[PDB]
Design a protein around this motif. Structure first.
Motif, mmCIF file in Angstrom:
data_model
loop_
_atom_site.group_PDB
_atom_site.id
_atom_site.type_symbol
_atom_site.label_atom_id
_atom_site.label_comp_id
_atom_site.label_asym_id
_atom_site.label_seq_id
_atom_site.Cartn_x
_atom_site.Cartn_y
_atom_site.Cartn_z
ATOM 1 N N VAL A 82 0.800 -1.209 0.000
ATOM 2 C CA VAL A 82 0.000 0.000 0.000
ATOM 3 C C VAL A 82 0.850 1.285 0.000
ATOM 4 C CG1 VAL A 82 -0.336 0.747 2.386
ATOM 5 C CG2 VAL A 82 -2.285 0.600 0.828
ATOM 6 N N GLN A 83 2.169 1.150 0.172
ATOM 7 C CA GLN A 83 3.078 2.302 0.155
ATOM 8 C C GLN A 83 3.834 2.398 -1.182
ATOM 9 O OE1 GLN A 83 5.033 3.690 3.824
ATOM 10 N NE2 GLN A 83 4.676 1.642 4.656
ATOM 11 N N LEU A 84 3.308 1.713 -2.186
ATOM 12 C CA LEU A 84 3.861 1.758 -3.524
ATOM 13 C C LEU A 84 2.665 2.309 -4.306
ATOM 14 C CD1 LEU A 84 5.437 -1.783 -3.664
ATOM 15 C CD2 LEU A 84 6.650 0.343 -3.302
ATOM 16 N N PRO A 85 2.634 3.637 -4.538
ATOM 17 C CA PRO A 85 1.566 4.345 -5.258
ATOM 18 C C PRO A 85 1.263 3.874 -6.682
ATOM 19 C CG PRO A 85 3.497 5.693 -5.240
ATOM 20 C CD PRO A 85 3.748 4.561 -4.250
ATOM 21 N N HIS A 86 2.278 3.421 -7.407
ATOM 22 C CA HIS A 86 2.061 2.939 -8.769
ATOM 23 C C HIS A 86 1.276 1.621 -8.783
ATOM 24 C CE1 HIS A 86 5.665 1.086 -7.161
ATOM 25 N NE2 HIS A 86 5.544 0.106 -8.040
ATOM 26 N N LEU A 87 0.692 1.252 -7.643
ATOM 27 C CA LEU A 87 -0.062 0.006 -7.541
ATOM 28 C C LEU A 87 -1.546 0.204 -7.272
ATOM 29 C CD1 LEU A 87 2.275 -2.455 -5.545
ATOM 30 C CD2 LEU A 87 1.713 -2.502 -7.945
ATOM 31 N N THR A 88 -2.366 -0.344 -8.161
ATOM 32 C CA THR A 88 -3.815 -0.255 -8.056
ATOM 33 C C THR A 88 -4.302 -1.426 -7.211
ATOM 34 O OG1 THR A 88 -4.213 -1.614 -10.048
ATOM 35 C CG2 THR A 88 -3.910 0.759 -10.378
ATOM 36 N N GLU A 89 -5.575 -1.420 -6.833
ATOM 37 C CA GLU A 89 -6.107 -2.526 -6.035
ATOM 38 C C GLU A 89 -5.902 -3.838 -6.800
ATOM 39 O OE1 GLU A 89 -7.702 0.772 -3.633
ATOM 40 O OE2 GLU A 89 -7.147 0.464 -5.748
ATOM 41 N N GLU A 90 -6.007 -3.751 -8.127
ATOM 42 C CA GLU A 90 -5.830 -4.906 -9.006
ATOM 43 C C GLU A 90 -4.369 -5.353 -8.953
ATOM 44 O OE1 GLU A 90 -7.815 -7.627 -11.596
ATOM 45 O OE2 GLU A 90 -8.487 -6.046 -10.198
ATOM 46 N N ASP A 91 -3.455 -4.401 -9.102
ATOM 47 C CA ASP A 91 -2.033 -4.704 -9.026
ATOM 48 C C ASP A 91 -1.730 -5.413 -7.702
ATOM 49 O OD1 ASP A 91 -0.999 -3.511 -11.483
ATOM 50 O OD2 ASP A 91 -1.408 -1.548 -10.573
ATOM 51 N N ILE A 92 -2.241 -4.873 -6.603
ATOM 52 C CA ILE A 92 -1.993 -5.488 -5.313
ATOM 53 C C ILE A 92 -2.476 -6.934 -5.337
ATOM 54 C CG2 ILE A 92 -2.509 -5.453 -2.859
ATOM 55 C CD1 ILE A 92 -2.790 -2.516 -2.964
ATOM 56 N N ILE A 93 -3.707 -7.132 -5.784
ATOM 57 C CA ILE A 93 -4.264 -8.468 -5.828
ATOM 58 C C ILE A 93 -3.406 -9.392 -6.681
ATOM 59 C CG2 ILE A 93 -6.243 -9.875 -6.467
ATOM 60 C CD1 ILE A 93 -8.025 -7.502 -5.838
ATOM 61 N N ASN A 94 -2.874 -8.862 -7.777
ATOM 62 C CA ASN A 94 -2.030 -9.654 -8.657
ATOM 63 C C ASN A 94 -0.688 -9.973 -8.014
ATOM 64 O OD1 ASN A 94 -3.808 -10.041 -10.862
ATOM 65 N ND2 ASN A 94 -3.270 -8.043 -11.756
ATOM 66 N N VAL A 95 -0.120 -9.034 -7.265
ATOM 67 C CA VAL A 95 1.143 -9.317 -6.596
ATOM 68 C C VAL A 95 0.900 -10.467 -5.632
ATOM 69 C CG1 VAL A 95 2.902 -8.508 -4.996
ATOM 70 C CG2 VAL A 95 2.001 -6.953 -6.710
ATOM 71 N N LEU A 96 -0.102 -10.318 -4.782
ATOM 72 C CA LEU A 96 -0.439 -11.343 -3.813
ATOM 73 C C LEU A 96 -0.572 -12.712 -4.460
ATOM 74 C CD1 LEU A 96 -3.106 -9.291 -1.884
ATOM 75 C CD2 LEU A 96 -0.898 -10.163 -0.960
ATOM 76 N N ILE A 97 -1.020 -12.727 -5.710
ATOM 77 C CA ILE A 97 -1.193 -13.991 -6.406
ATOM 78 C C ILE A 97 0.148 -14.584 -6.829
ATOM 79 C CG2 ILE A 97 -2.098 -15.093 -8.473
ATOM 80 C CD1 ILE A 97 -4.520 -13.219 -8.205
ATOM 81 N N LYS A 98 0.984 -13.760 -7.451
ATOM 82 C CA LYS A 98 2.284 -14.213 -7.911
ATOM 83 C C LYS A 98 3.153 -14.692 -6.763
ATOM 84 C CE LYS A 98 1.223 -13.295 -12.161
ATOM 85 N NZ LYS A 98 0.367 -12.058 -12.151
#
Ligand code: ZN
Ligand code: ZN
Length: 507
Positions: free
Chosen positions: A362-378
């Protein structure tokens, strides 16, 4: 578990009945807080275990919204002294949003309880009284006046407190012409009571109406009699030697010929490093299930001190771990705690994104809720196949982490990525070690964090670099600090070519 005990003690003490009655109650004289909620929760948990034994239960939550208006809190206009003496359910609303003073505080609490999924029968003293639902029990009070006075002086004397005033009645009156409290002057042997309104006045009122309220000492046990209350926890202050309970344990008997319900003392509730705290405050950063679990994980007489700061990260981890063990998706007593904290029956495990890691993502602004969800997946924290509940739970928690970082997190854990590297001393050894890590990252588009993390110690070990020099340097080049987020999952979350160029000290 302690709730299953008290459940056994209730089936035992009280006789084995069909449907049991559990009760909680509060006076809406101001914001009902995290400490008041403990009472309702304690009644609900015991009531919950009671069903866990096949019995049926009714959880009554009584709102003493018919109590007089004693004091004017803070934030409430001072110009409201004019309503003192009036029952709260008839005092205006300082902010206008509701019909009464009592409604403003009752609505907030009932709404806060729903998000927890806890069901109860909400009753309102003001309505029960007005409807004359208490006519009879009120008369008995007058019929056993001398008995009541006897009992109260019995305890007042043990504590060497002076006896009740000579002309003391077990109830008050609300003047129909001004709605303010008033001392009762006379009574018959049935209904009708005379009162001496404050200042200058006199008059008669019929008990069968709704303007004759039973003083609290009698009003409580009467309530235990009217409904069949079998269990009702209460604050320490009501369980002290000659207090509410002990004095009611006698009045309900000698007056309504009933046995008082069993009770339990629940202790204080607050936040660490610490002005009232409401369930709404906890909601800003704690999932509703977590709140429930926190109250189910402690013993009633052990105070609850929730750490909303740095300790919230281990809170979520321990909570998550228990949820995993519960559904066996991971390697005894905590198991039943999970069940009892849940109003509904456990269905299945819901995607758990590690709080401590969302605080980082959440402290990486270039990340959308979708991006976050995708990181968590990878990085494999949540399954690739997310249900509706799953995405719903991960999104809320992301918002909870965003709220925690802004308001509760210590300054130390805040960080920001440096777009350009700082000029920092970097030895030939670290330089070559960073070059090795970059190469491994360049030849491994895909990989598990766990291994990436092993590779980070491997390279440091091969070159002979300590932890403080190795990690403090990488932290400095990346976020300009000596310490920071768990390294492996941090770096993996960033643009890959950005990490490589930075490790190669060229961008
Ligand atoms: Zn309001
Ligand atoms: Zn009057």
């Amino acid at each position: 578990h302690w709730a299953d005990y008290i459940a056994d003690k209730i089936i035992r003490e009280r006789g084995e009945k069909e449907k049991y009655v559990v009760e909680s109650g509060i006076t809406p004289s101001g914001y009902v807080h995290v400490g008041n909620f403990r009472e309702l929760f304690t009644a609900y948990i015991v009531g919950h275990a009671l069903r866990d034994k096949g019995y049926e239960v009714r959880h009554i939550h009584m709102w003493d919204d018919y109590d007089r208006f004693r004091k004017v809190p803070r934030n409430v206009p001072q110009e409201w002294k004019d309503y003192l003496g009036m029952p709260i359910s008839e005092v205006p609303d300082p902010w206008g949003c509701h019909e009464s003073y009592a409604e403003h505080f009752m609505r907030k609490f009932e709404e806060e309880v729903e998000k927890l999924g806890i069901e109860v029968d909400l009753l309102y003293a003001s309505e029960l009284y007005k409807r004359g639902e208490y006519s009879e029990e009120i008369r008995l009070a007058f019929e056993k006046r001398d008995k009541i006075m006897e009992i109260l002086n019995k305890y007042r004397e043990i504590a060497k407190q002076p006896p009740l005033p000579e002309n003391w009645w077990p109830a008050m009156v609300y003047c129909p012409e001004h709605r303010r409290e008033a001392e009762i002057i006379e009574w018959d042997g049935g209904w009708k009571v005379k009162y001496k309104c404050p200042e200058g006045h006199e008059g008669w009122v019929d008990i069968r109406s709704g303007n004759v309220k039973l003083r609290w000492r009698v009003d409580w046990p009467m309530r235990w009699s009217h409904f069949g209350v079998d269990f009702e926890p209460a604050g320490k202050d009501h369980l002290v030697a000659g207090s509410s309970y002990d004095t009611g344990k006698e009045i309900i008997k000698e007056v309504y010929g009933k046995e008082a319900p069993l009770s339990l003392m629940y202790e204080f509730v607050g936040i660490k490093g610490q002005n009232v705290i409401l369930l709404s405050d906890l909601y800003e950063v704690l999932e509703p299930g977590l709140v429930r679990f926190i109250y189910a994980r402690h013993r009633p007489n052990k105070e609850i001190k929730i750490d909303l700061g740095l300790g919230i990260l281990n809170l979520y981890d321990e909570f998550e771990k228990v949820e995993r063990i519960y559904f066996g998706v991971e390697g005894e007593e905590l198991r039943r705690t999970y069940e009892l904290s849940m109003p509904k029956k456990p269905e299945r495990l819901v995607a758990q994104a590690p709080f401590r890691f969302l605080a980082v993502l959440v402290q990486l602004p270039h990340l959308t809720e979708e991006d976050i969800i995708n990181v968590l997946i990878k990085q494999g924290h949540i399954p690739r196949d997310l249900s509706k509940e799953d995405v719903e739970r991960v999104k809320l928690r992301i918002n909870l982490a965003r709220n925690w970082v802004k308001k509760y997190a210590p300054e130390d854990v805040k960080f920001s990525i440096l777009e350009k590297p700082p000029e920092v001393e970097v030895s030939e050894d670290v330089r070559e070690a960073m070059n090795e890590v970059a190469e491994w990252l360049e030849n491994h588009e895909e990989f598990s964090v766990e291994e990436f993390n092993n590779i980070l110690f491997e390279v440091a070990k091969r070159r002979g670099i300590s932890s403080r020099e190795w990690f403090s340097t990488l932290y400095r080049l990346f976020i300009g600090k000596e310490r920071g987020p768990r390294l492996a999952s941090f770096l993996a979350s960033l643009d890959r070519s950005f990490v490589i160029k930075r490790l190669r000290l060229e961008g």
